[PDB]
Amino acid sequence: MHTETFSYLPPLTDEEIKKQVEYILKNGWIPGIEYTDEPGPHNSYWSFWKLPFFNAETAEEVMEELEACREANPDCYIKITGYDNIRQGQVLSFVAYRP
Amino acid sequence: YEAGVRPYRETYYDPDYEPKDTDLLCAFRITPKPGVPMEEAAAAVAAESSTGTWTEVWSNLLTDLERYKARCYRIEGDVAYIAYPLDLFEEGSIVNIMSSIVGNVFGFKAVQALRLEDMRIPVAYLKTFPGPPTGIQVERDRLNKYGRPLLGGTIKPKLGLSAKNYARVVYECLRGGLDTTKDDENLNSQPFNRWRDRFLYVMEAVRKAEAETGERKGHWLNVTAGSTEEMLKRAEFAAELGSRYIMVDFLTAGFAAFASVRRRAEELGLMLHCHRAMHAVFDRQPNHGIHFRVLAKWLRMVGGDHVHTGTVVGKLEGDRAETLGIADLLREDYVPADPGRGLFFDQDWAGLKPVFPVASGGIHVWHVPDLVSIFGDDAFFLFGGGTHGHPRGSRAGATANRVAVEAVVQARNEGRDILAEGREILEEAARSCPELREAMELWGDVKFEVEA
Amino acid sequence: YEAGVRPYRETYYDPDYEPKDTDLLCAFRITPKPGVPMEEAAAAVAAESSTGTWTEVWSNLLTDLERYKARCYRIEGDVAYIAYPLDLFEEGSIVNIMSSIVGNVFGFKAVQALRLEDMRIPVAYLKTFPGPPTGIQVERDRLNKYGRPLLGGTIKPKLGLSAKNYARVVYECLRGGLDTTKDDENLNSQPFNRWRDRFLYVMEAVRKAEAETGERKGHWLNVTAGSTEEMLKRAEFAAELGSRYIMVDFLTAGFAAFASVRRRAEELGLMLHCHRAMHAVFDRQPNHGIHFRVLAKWLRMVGGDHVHTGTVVGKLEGDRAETLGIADLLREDYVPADPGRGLFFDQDWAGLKPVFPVASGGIHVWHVPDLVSIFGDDAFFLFGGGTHGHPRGSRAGATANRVAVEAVVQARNEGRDILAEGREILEEAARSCPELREAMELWGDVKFEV
Amino acid sequence: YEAGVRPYRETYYDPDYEPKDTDLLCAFRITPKPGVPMEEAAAAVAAESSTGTWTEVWSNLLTDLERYKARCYRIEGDVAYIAYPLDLFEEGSIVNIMSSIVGNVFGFKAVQALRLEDMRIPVAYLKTFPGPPTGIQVERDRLNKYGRPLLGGTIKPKLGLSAKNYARVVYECLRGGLDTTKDDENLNSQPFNRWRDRFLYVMEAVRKAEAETGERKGHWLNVTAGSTEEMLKRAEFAAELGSRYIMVDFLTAGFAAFASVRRRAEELGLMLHCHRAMHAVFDRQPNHGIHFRVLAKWLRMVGGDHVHTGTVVGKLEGDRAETLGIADLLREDYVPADPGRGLFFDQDWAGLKPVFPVASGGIHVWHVPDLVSIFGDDAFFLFGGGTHGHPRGSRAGATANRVAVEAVVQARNEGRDILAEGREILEEAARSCPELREAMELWGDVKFEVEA
Amino acid sequence: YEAGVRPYRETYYDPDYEPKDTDLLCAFRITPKPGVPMEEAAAAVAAESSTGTWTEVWSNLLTDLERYKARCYRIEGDVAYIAYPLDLFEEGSIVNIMSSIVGNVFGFKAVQALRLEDMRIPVAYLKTFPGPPTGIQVERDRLNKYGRPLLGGTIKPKLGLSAKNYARVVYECLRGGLDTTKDDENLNSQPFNRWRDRFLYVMEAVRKAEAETGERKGHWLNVTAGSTEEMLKRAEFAAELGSRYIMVDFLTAGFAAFASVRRRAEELGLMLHCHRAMHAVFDRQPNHGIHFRVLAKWLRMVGGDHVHTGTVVGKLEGDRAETLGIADLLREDYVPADPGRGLFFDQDWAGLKPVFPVASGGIHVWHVPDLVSIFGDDAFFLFGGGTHGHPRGSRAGATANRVAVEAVVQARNEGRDILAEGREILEEAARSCPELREAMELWGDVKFEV
Numbered sequence A: 001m002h003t004e005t006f007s008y009l010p011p012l013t014d015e016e017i018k019k020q021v022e023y024i025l026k027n028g029w030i031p032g033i034e035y036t037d038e039p040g041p042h043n044s045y046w047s048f049w050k051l052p053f054f055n056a057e058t059a060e061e062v063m064e065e066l067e068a069c070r071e072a073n074p075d076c077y078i079k080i081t082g083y084d085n086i087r088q089g090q091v092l093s094f095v096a097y098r099p
Numbered sequence B, D: 001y002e003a004g005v006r007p008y009r010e011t012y013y014d015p016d017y018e019p020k021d022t023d024l025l026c027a028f029r030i031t032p033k034p035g036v037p038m039e040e041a042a043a044a045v046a047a048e049s050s051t052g053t054w055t056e057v058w059s060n061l062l063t064d065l066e067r068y069k070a071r072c073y074r075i076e077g078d079v080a081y082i083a084y085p086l087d088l089f090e091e092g093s094i095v096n097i098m099s100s101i102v103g104n105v106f107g108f109k110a111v112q113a114l115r116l117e118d119m120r121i122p123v124a125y126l127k128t129f130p131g132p133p134t135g136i137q138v139e140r141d142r143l144n145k146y147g148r149p150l151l152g153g154t155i156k157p158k159l160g161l162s163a164k165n166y167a168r169v170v171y172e173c174l175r176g177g178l179d180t181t182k183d184d185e186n187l188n189s190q191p192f193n194r195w196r197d198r199f200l201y202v203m204e205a206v207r208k209a210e211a212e213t214g215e216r217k218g219h220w221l222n223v224t225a226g227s228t229e230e231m232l233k234r235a236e237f238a239a240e241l242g243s244r245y246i247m248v249d250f251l252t253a254g255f256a257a258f259a260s261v262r263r264r265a266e267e268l269g270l271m272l273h274c275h276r277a278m279h280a281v282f283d284r285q286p287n288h289g290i291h292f293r294v295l296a297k298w299l300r301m302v303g304g305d306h307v308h309t310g311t312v313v314g315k316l317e318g319d320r321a322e323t324l325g326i327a328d329l330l331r332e333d334y335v336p337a338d339p340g341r342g343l344f345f346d347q348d349w350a351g352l353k354p355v356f357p358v359a360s361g362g363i364h365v366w367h368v369p370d371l372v373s374i375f376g377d378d379a380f381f382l383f384g385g386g387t388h389g390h391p392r393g394s395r396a397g398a399t400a401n402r403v404a405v406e407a408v409v410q411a412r413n414e415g416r417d418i419l420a421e422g423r424e425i426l427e428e429a430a431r432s433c434p435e436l437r438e439a440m441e442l443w444g445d446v447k448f449e450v451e452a
Numbered sequence C, E: 001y002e003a004g005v006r007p008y009r010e011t012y013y014d015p016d017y018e019p020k021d022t023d024l025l026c027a028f029r030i031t032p033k034p035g036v037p038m039e040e041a042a043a044a045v046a047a048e049s050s051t052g053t054w055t056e057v058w059s060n061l062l063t064d065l066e067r068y069k070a071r072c073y074r075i076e077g078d079v080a081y082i083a084y085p086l087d088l089f090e091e092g093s094i095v096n097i098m099s100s101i102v103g104n105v106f107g108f109k110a111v112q113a114l115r116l117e118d119m120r121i122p123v124a125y126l127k128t129f130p131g132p133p134t135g136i137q138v139e140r141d142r143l144n145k146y147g148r149p150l151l152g153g154t155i156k157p158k159l160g161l162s163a164k165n166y167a168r169v170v171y172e173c174l175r176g177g178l179d180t181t182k183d184d185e186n187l188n189s190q191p192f193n194r195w196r197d198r199f200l201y202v203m204e205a206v207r208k209a210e211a212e213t214g215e216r217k218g219h220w221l222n223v224t225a226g227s228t229e230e231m232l233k234r235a236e237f238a239a240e241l242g243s244r245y246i247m248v249d250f251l252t253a254g255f256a257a258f259a260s261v262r263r264r265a266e267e268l269g270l271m272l273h274c275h276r277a278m279h280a281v282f283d284r285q286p287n288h289g290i291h292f293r294v295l296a297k298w299l300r301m302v303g304g305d306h307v308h309t310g311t312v313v314g315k316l317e318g319d320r321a322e323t324l325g326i327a328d329l330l331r332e333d334y335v336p337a338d339p340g341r342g343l344f345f346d347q348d349w350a351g352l353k354p355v356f357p358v359a360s361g362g363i364h365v366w367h368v369p370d371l372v373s374i375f376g377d378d379a380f381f382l383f384g385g386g387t388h389g390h391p392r393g394s395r396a397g398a399t400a401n402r403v404a405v406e407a408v409v410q411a412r413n414e415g416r417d418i419l420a421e422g423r424e425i426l427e428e429a430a431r432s433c434p435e436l437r438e439a440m441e442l443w444g445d446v447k448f449e450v
């Protein structure tokens, strides 16, 4: 099973994930974390980890939330999302952790 | 009344006129017949695309031509600016725009050559059009794909493949990493491959590749047909099979039938790929015709979810500056003028949904860094020959292109310069993807000339 | 398999190929990019309009490309002849023809200009098309009009006239001797004149002029609209009102919706006037586009009852020799090749009904001798400005144009050279028709270059 | 995010905002709850008619509220000016306008009273509406009537007449000089008079009076019914009988069903009389409700060929200044603002067809000079009681009213002052028309109070 | 005959008239123009809402006005009671009722203000109406929900949310314990959110929340549109997607199109939520308009499955006593007159199905004790801001509102005084529900005046 963007590259390291989070934040977009144990074409609504981090200021705050989501849901796929409320749509979504 | 022939300029050339925000404006590049002054040729175009004819008629006095007449209000170099009052146009009808603006004026003896460069569609007229049935944002939400250009490819050979062989190629492409595949513009229903047979088998391949990859897939099933009724029948069947997409050649089918298909696509929940077949018959030459940026505007007004825009670097002609303007016209809410890109007017899009640019034709892995730089994420890159021409077939070719796009996107997002480091980025990814290395080796010497 | 780029010429140029009577043939005038030879330019057009692409694909080996490929079989100077197998095309679909023949090949970097000059439609493909829904013979029988060109005219101003005023001009034209009148190509439905209002009033004018003159009349009601459904709705209302005619801008509306209306026109008993708006965008220049003779063939195949062909002598451009060939292409059962007229191929028409040529645009009474000489009897001559621009208005102007045509027809039938005696014939007729005299005086100095 | 309740004014009061030409503007007369500042009450109206609610929600940050929110941009006296971005409204839907602008904000505890006085409909939104199916000019051309107000009248008693008796009164009115007659707003289909019976007999009376007088006639057959399907059925039958007209109570039937009837009237070639039954439930009081000038705008947008506007001098309330503004809003291409007439904004009508004002209710011959002075030629004057209440019945009453209108029009055209000489003009005509003299004698003392 | 103006009172005031069980009765509160007595003001309303006009007409003698006239039969202070014969009204048409009862009589110079306070619909006229297409009992059986108020909530922001984001909020609300969610009344189809996009995504959210919670769910998809045809089209798509619900703004759309959708809803198996948008324009002020209890009766007659009735304690105005009467009018088979609640007439409902009251607008957890006390179990409580405004978002907010309702229902059933112990009950429930505790803390100081 592939997971859309970047799933055809080698699994991303912690540094590479953080660099994508920095890309999201640099462009003024909102980072977010989603997870599910039921990935696949049928699932358009992964579980939110908290709410989108509208108040986030650093990539490190986001990486911390990714680790807390992983600890609570180690059996789940977990993806990073970047959101733009001007176009009103996700501008990036990739899986950061696989079970 | 005063019967007899008068110069067109006495009534239809008015350089004192101030265009209104509701006027439709045109920028015509005029080559007058030798001996015909520019002002008279521009007045002829204005007159014969609105209210006038070749001699004074008594019935002119029954109406208020000061209200309805078009006016050439500015001549700059060889460009005539002409303003058309809002009341001249039928609401929601691109067909009506064409019948006035490009109906007869391109064949007058007084004007040796005429090229419509641009058109300012007034906001008040735009609101009479529905725009794309899906639009970039809703389409990404339907596909659940974010953060990269999307991958597609035309099935090849253009014609001559059976329906089952056709479906086999589709299956190999989609299971290899392409998001979509498509019928060639000239593949409709033919003795060697009838449309019901193709639709049925192709959708089996789509569902199979979707289930095996876990990623949502689609095939752009061409409904282009000889009559509007036949096209709607094929769209209905695509929806009955669960296709997310249909495809229409909107210029060869024509705008009236295009509008009918767009309405039905929304009713049936289908996303609508638009192929611009025949466009170069109108838009190739710089001295006579209609530039594609005008056709792209009309396309977004009727409602297409994607349209081809050129590659710049591929096998079909397309200038970088003009292509960049066309992409903005398709995707942005407001595009300022820039004659350097052929945009003679600003264009407010009045909240209409945006359209996916589609880059297709003679491209392969080595072009990906340039394509990402030109278009960014919101575009489709189509590899037909560049997929099935891979040394190991379509599945391998598909994976190579998908990997090339993702690696360039990753590098860009990290801050790398994907133009200066384009080659090195591709070579790095090729170290973890033999399919890419074989693609790069096969086509490394295949290049087309480029124009900025 | 052998992956990689190959020359188009290898597969798609075959100078030994002998065309089949079932092949579709194209004559392309090619301007290659500098350094690209005609053979590779032609092969690229053939390949990218049939089966090929820019690099070799493994799936080519699943089929037999020898059966399906298009082939350039002859080159003469800058003209390449390409043959397309019958199996390549969808039956009854001009849309499919264009999608292949003119789909992408006009925009390749390798070919900097391209003009489709002519096309040989094989009888076997013609038989998949219905042709005109009425045709010249049946139309003359429906009108009960024989032995002269038919008279018409566009209502003017093009736009800006209310429905009732529009029908007044129609009434004046028809009661004065015009056989028909017509909506301007860009008159559809607009704030100043909505189509249902126009259709109702105009048909009152038509019925009134018919009762008063004793001659059958018609108005070409423009059904052109933004969607096929709306066009069909307007055609249904025309029929409900008893109109003999409707009108469609077949290029701006498009061939698919054109096909839809032509079918509906035959079902409803309507005759179908076809306006070629937009044609000059791509059929004017000698280096690029599609020659009108090709458009004219496609028009007759789908099924138009008339189509504009130009005037030669009027305000819009047109060549006399090429126009004679186009008139034959529209009206005859068989048309042999003729280099002098730009007819590259013999064209059999397989029993398809004939189409009325329509000459319109900047013409007045002085042009009638030329127009009768060019087209003969089976044509419409339209006088818009040439009718309403008469010093005494549309009725007097209509009578002048009708008289002029009849006098020139009479003179021709008696054996007179209507070109050599054109002015003299008009002057003879003018002695018994003051309206004609005034038209002659007003426009005597109004000439266009040929 | 920051959860919790914030004052509405922090987000929805912005006196720095400059309205755009595409914004929809409203002028609300606000009476705040004692203790609630004007700014907060106006912000509440702005918030709860666009995007906001009573507490901050996390999902606000998913969109760009700077783009979508309505803003109170000016407070002057007790009038709040509020601007609504174009994207908030569904194209061509009066129903959507109402659901936002007057949906909930009239019932907030923070606002004790609220009255919508006026609304600036932007040109770009107007173009999404079709307007009248016929319009004044085409309607006069259909009737072949020019140069005078047109005559009509409601059949009376309102209810209780059989279909054949109903047709008899119609026949007498029309053959006596009235151009039209009409069903009462509350006459639909009832046990004493079923609609098919009425339609059939009435159209016999219409054709008979038309043939006998030589003048084109019509009866406004009421299609108002309990469902949209039933109304369309009755319109179809009216068209099958050859009626030039149907009638609809557009507010009691409602705008959605009104739009359906308007579309079908155009399809069937019917002119559409619109009765404003129920309007005074909304528009009577100056402290709370919707003024009729707003409803008249919506009426012209959907498409009515006539609508009642008041008489000023008759039995139903209507101020002269406000009535004059309403007439301009219905007939003119552009109406400048004038708060003296309650017009707080200019209104460009973007080429929409004009609507006939209809003056009806408690009027008779003595009012004709005033009515001609107020409305001019482009209006209908309806005499129901003022026709059938003539001492000699409806035919005689009809002739009296027709003669009164024509004599006043003739006098006006000659240059006479029809207000100063109103009585003398009527008395002069009465010398050649005994029917008029008896009407003048019967109702000479019947007067209603007037307000400028 | 006797031409001339007569007093309305002569024919249309009859204090000796005894109402018939088949009469339609109206209670009007009248503010006459100064100097106009109540009797003539009432007679004018009666006459100009039935058979009469301003002067005597000869055609009155063709019929028997005694059979058809409306009659004011009683006046108490500024309240006039008027009786209308059954024959005056079109069967099954609320539109006809309004055209007579509120058609012109609110705009007469003689009556400066007028309020319709109540109306007695006779059983014989009620039987011409179908009533709700589902009704409380059948709806509870379709939902499999018994013994508590049902939970709902409007998605917020009202406008500006894309389709996919809209469905995310729906998903969070429903999976957190809300039974339903709904489109805002002014959310129809707009550039930022087109209805087909919303309907598709929302129903994915509904099905997902239903599978995950094991409880049946619904979203009130707003079909309100500019024409009846479009509304019916949107209802058909809702059914095609398997939605249990659609929603209509019955006053802004209008009663005629309302009637059309209600018929279509029963045919398609859809339950019909009714929003009363616009009602406050004319039902708020005590001197003029139509009281909501009258609107509520008309709503139940046409056929709505729910209708908003106000909250009393929330952000929009509403009287507790009047609201208790309206709830009975919507839910009971028989409702006796009660001056304390403004019920002027006894109302038999002739077996018409009952309607769910819906309490919505500015309410949060602290209002649940009041809301349960006012409405009982057969009602919807909607929390829009009160759900998405939760510090942790819509899911946590939904759970808090569901828990609050259930705890208060449990306490009531055990015999506790939920008004006297309202806070205590919420605090008990909050000990086992952190989401409820946080909601209580956030909105503890947010009160509206009653």
Ligand SMILES: O=C(O)[C@@](O)(COP(=O)(O)O)[C@H](O)[C@H](O)COP(=O)(O)O
Binding pocket: B153, B154, B156, B184, B185, B276, B277, B308, B309, B310, B311, B316, B358, B359, B360, B361, B362, B363, B382, B383, B384, B385, B386, C048, C053, C054, C104, C107
């Ligand atoms: O028919 C073709 O050539 C293609 O299928 C490309 O095939 P390859 O991918 O094998 O080149 C596309 O239709 C063209 O790109 C269209 O041109 P444009 O995009 O300029 O309209």
Ligand SMILES: O=C(O)[C@@](O)(COP(=O)(O)O)[C@H](O)[C@H](O)COP(=O)(O)O
Binding pocket: B048, B053, B054, B104, C153, C154, C156, C158, C184, C185, C276, C277, C308, C309, C310, C311, C316, C358, C359, C360, C361, C362, C363, C382, C383, C384, C385, C386
């Ligand atoms: O719009 C016009 O100019 C006309 O109405 C002519 O008006 P006049 O009769 O007043 O010249 C015709 O449409 C043109 O002749 C079409 O050109 P073609 O026939 O070459 O397609």
Ligand SMILES: O=C(O)[C@@](O)(COP(=O)(O)O)[C@H](O)[C@H](O)COP(=O)(O)O
Binding pocket: D153, D154, D156, D184, D185, D276, D277, D308, D309, D310, D311, D316, D358, D359, D360, D361, D362, D363, D382, D383, D384, D385, D386, E048, E053, E054, E104, E107
């Ligand atoms: O029912 C009526 O009273 C009328 O038939 C008038 O009858 P008379 O001609 O006998 O007075 C009209 O409906 C009102 O004028 C409508 O009021 P408006 O025009 O203000 O909407």
Ligand SMILES: O=C(O)[C@@](O)(COP(=O)(O)O)[C@H](O)[C@H](O)COP(=O)(O)O
Binding pocket: D048, D053, D054, D104, E153, E154, E156, E158, E184, E185, E276, E277, E308, E309, E310, E311, E316, E358, E359, E360, E361, E362, E363, E382, E383, E384, E385, E386
């Ligand atoms: O638009 C609104 O305000 C609501 O969505 C409430 O939102 P909150 O739940 O965020 O307050 C409802 O439509 C109103 O309650 C209707 O008023 P009524 O129920 O009185 O008709």
Ligand SMILES: [Mg+2]
Binding pocket: B154, B183, B184, B185, B186
């Ligand atoms: Mg192709």
Ligand SMILES: [Mg+2]
Binding pocket: C154, C183, C184, C185, C186
């Ligand atoms: Mg024309």
Ligand SMILES: [Mg+2]
Binding pocket: D154, D183, D184, D185, D186
């Ligand atoms: Mg009435």
Ligand SMILES: [Mg+2]
Binding pocket: E154, E183, E184, E185, E186
């Ligand atoms: Mg709401």
